[PDB]
């Protein structure tokens, strides 16, 4: 588990991370004020299960609230009112103990940070940016969901809570908080939220200033069709759009190309995610996932958000895929500890580890069989992966002696290793 930036100075922190998304959407409602306490107690098991990092929820307190139709929400962290750590997940003191316990067990803690907007309208907060000083996107004329003079990116919904991240004083505010998270809360890196709401270069700057050598990941969720007609991106692939962001922020990016293929393509089409790209410079910057707090289910109310959920009969296949392939994989809290995929994932993580699969490992796709058949070249062993495939045996696609590593779902999930 080394460190170092990629050959392109991209902050993938050694290319051998295995991340646990340390929360689900309904945590504030299912274990109110008690999440840091649970993470603290489970620190030893997370480390033993094989994760080298954990994506923690937004540490900034959120007392927001909404009701839309028959749904309600708030306090999850994405509509924060100040940097005070005494929120819905637990107290400042409890966060410090969780971070320490996690760090102590060998799991780097990555905080989710939301620079785009804040709960501008909350009455009792410690940050008060008055209007008319250029601190807000809406301090400038705001025609549409396009960059204006006060906000160099898209806006969140109405844009009325969007910050001018480029304003010297705002940039500085975030900068110092990132430094704070790092030296007082054990930050080993950050997950940048809603990266489409502000310039990618600003992310590069923040990291340069506070955590140059840490890990970073940006959440860019914007399809080709969201860009203007005359924009090069309007007719670009999902890979291109996200690679472009990663080149500019110098941070790994969530593989929405893969997610898109998982949702709308067939299993054989998964070789079209950013992680399957034949150029190591492209692959190695992908941060793969099966579902997250937005896309997937969560225990509790409404089944969570489930905006782009994976078909239930592909969950094991999806995990065998991300866990044996290039890019940096992210495991969803619930699959691991709530829905019983624990044993299955532990297995795959051990296979990834023994094989020495890393972010830039080579992967080749075989086309003469049904499903997905891939040969992954780990630094230690070669993996042959067959998902929902009629492949007979590894020898049909690769030379050398093979031993079965995994065999689940009726032969639907098969992995062999040299």
Ligand X SMILES: OC[C@H]1O[C@H](O[C@H]2[C@H](O)[C@@H](O)[C@@H](O[C@H]3[C@H](O)[C@@H](O)[C@@H](O[C@H]4[C@H](O)[C@@H](O)[C@@H](O)O[C@@H]4CO)O[C@@H]3CO)O[C@@H]2CO)[C@H](O)[C@@H](O)[C@@H]1O
Residues lying near ligand X in the complex (CB under 6 A) are found at 64, 66, 68, 76, 78-79, 114, 156-158, 160-161, 193-194, 219, 293-294, 305
Phi then psi for residue 386, to 5 deg, are: -130, 110
Three-state SS at 1: coil
In terms of residues, how long is the chain?
418
Q: Which range touches Ca ion (CB under 5 A), out of 27-35, 155-163, 283-291, 401-409?
A: 155-163
Q: Which range touches Ca ion (CB under 5 A), out of 53-61, 152-160, 278-286, 342-350?
A: 152-160
| Distance of closest approach, residue 197 Cβ to ligand X, in angstroms | 8
Residue 394 binding result from ligand X, Ca ion, none, given CB thresholds of 5 to 8 Å by partner type: none
Strands 286-289 and 328-332: parallel
Rounded CA-CA distance 328/343 in Å is 20
Q: Is residue 14 involved in binding Ca ion (CB under 5 A)? A: yes
| Distance of closest approach, residue 378 Cβ to ligand X, in angstroms | 32
| Distance of closest approach, residue 252 Cβ to ligand X, in angstroms | 16
Of residues 13 and 293, the one with the C-beta less far from ligand X: 293
| Distance of closest approach, residue 194 Cβ to ligand X, in angstroms | 4
Residues sharing a CB contact under 8 Å with residue 398, sequence separation 6 or more, in sequence order: 375, 382, 384
Residue 226 binding result from Ca ion, ligand X, none, given CB thresholds of 5 to 8 Å by partner type: none
Residue 136 binding result from ligand X, Ca ion, none, given CB thresholds of 5 to 8 Å by partner type: none
| Distance of closest approach, residue 374 Cβ to ligand X, in angstroms | 29
Site for Ca ion in 190-229 (CB under 5 A): 197
Q: Is residue 162 involved in binding Ca ion (CB under 5 A)? A: yes
- Assess contact for 35 and 57: CB atoms under 8 A: yes
Q: Which two tokens stand for residue 314?
A: 């592909």
Residue whose tokens read 């809570």: 161
Residue 162 binding result from ligand X, Ca ion, none, given CB thresholds of 5 to 8 Å by partner type: Ca ion
Q: Which of 11, 13, 24, 196 binds Ca ion (CB under 5 A)?
A: 13
Residues sharing a CB contact under 8 Å with residue 32, sequence separation 6 or more, in sequence order: 88
Of residues 73 and 273, the one with the C-beta less far from ligand X: 73
- Assess contact for 215 and 108: CB atoms under 8 A: yes
Nearest of 208, 210, 131, 122 to residue 163 by alpha carbon? 131
Note the Cα 96 to chain centre separation in Å. 23
Of residues 119 and 381, the one with the C-beta less far from ligand X: 119
Q: Is residue 153 involved in binding Ca ion (CB under 5 A)? A: yes
Three-state SS at 219: coil
- Assess contact for 84 and 60: CB atoms under 8 A: yes
Residue 78 binding result from ligand X, Ca ion, none, given CB thresholds of 5 to 8 Å by partner type: ligand X
Q: Is residue 1 involved in binding Ca ion (CB under 5 A)? A: yes
DSSP 310: P
- Assess contact for 271 and 307: CB atoms under 8 A: no
Of residues 116 and 389, the one with the C-beta less far from Ca ion: 116
Residue 161 binding result from Ca ion, ligand X, none, given CB thresholds of 5 to 8 Å by partner type: ligand X
- What does the longest C-alpha to C-alpha distance in the chain come to? 70
Residue 114 binding result from Ca ion, ligand X, none, given CB thresholds of 5 to 8 Å by partner type: ligand X
| Distance of closest approach, residue 214 Cβ to Ca ion, in angstroms | 10
Nearest of 210, 195, 354 to residue 287 by alpha carbon? 195
Neighbours of 167 (CB within 10 A): 18
| Distance of closest approach, residue 79 Cβ to ligand X, in angstroms | 4
Rounded CA-CA distance 146/363 in Å is 38
| Distance of closest approach, residue 307 Cβ to ligand X, in angstroms | 7
Rounded CA-CA distance 295/299 in Å is 13
| Distance of closest approach, residue 25 Cβ to ligand X, in angstroms | 8
Residues that bind Ca ion (CB under 5 A): 1, 3, 13-14, 116, 151, 153, 155, 162, 197
């Amino acid at each position: 588990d080394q460190a170092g930036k990629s050959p392109n100075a991209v902050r993938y922190h050694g290319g051998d991370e295995i991340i646990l998304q340390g929360f689900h959407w309904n945590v504030v409602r299912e274990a109110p004020n008690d999440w840091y306490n649970i993470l603290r107690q489970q620190a030893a098991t997370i480390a033993a299960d094989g994760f080298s990092a954990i994506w923690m929820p937004v540490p900034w307190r959120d007392f927001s609230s909404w009701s839309d139709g028959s749904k309600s929400g708030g306090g999850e962290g994405y509509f924060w009112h100040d940097f005070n750590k005494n929120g819905r997940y637990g107290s400042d003191a409890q966060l410090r103990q969780a971070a320490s316990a996690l760090g102590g067990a060998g799991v780097k803690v990555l905080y989710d940070v939301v620079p785009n907007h804040m709960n501008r309208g909350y009455p009792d907060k410690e940050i008060n940016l008055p209007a008319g000083q250029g601190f807000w996107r809406n301090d400038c004329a705001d025609p549409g969901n396009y960059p204006n003079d006060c906000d160099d990116g898209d806006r969140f919904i109405g844009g009325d809570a969007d910050l001018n991240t480029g304003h010297p004083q705002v940039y500085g505010m975030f900068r110092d908080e990132f430094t704070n998270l790092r030296s007082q809360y054990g930050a080993g890196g950050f997950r940048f939220d809603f990266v489409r709401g502000y310039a990618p270069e600003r992310v590069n700057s923040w990291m340069t200033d506070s955590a140059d050598n840490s890990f970073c990941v940006g959440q860019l969720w914007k399809g080709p069709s969201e860009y203007p007609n005359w924009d090069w991106r309007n007719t670009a692939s999902w890979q291109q759009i996200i690679k472009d962001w990663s080149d500019r922020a110098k941070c790994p990016v969530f593989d929405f190309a893969l997610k898109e293929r998982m949702q709308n393509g067939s299993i054989a089409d998964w070789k079209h995610g950013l992680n399957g790209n034949p150029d190591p410079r492209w692959r190695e910057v992908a941060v793969t996932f099966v579902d997250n707090h937005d896309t997937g289910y969560s225990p509790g109310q409404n089944g969570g958000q489930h905006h782009w959920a994976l078909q239930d009969g592909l969950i094991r296949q999806a995990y065998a895929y991300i866990l044996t392939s290039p890019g940096t994989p992210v495991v969803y809290w619930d699959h691991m500890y709530d829905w019983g995929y624990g044993d299955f994932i532990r297995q795959l993580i051990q296979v990834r580890r023994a094989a020495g699969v890393r972010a830039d490992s080579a992967i080749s796709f075989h086309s003469g069989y049904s499903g997905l058949v891939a040969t992954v070249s780990g630094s230690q062993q070669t993996l042959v992966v067959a998902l929902n495939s009629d492949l007979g045996n590894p020898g049909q696609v690769a030379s050398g002696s093979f031993s079965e590593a995994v065999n689940a779902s009726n032969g639907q999930v098969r992995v062999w290793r040299s």
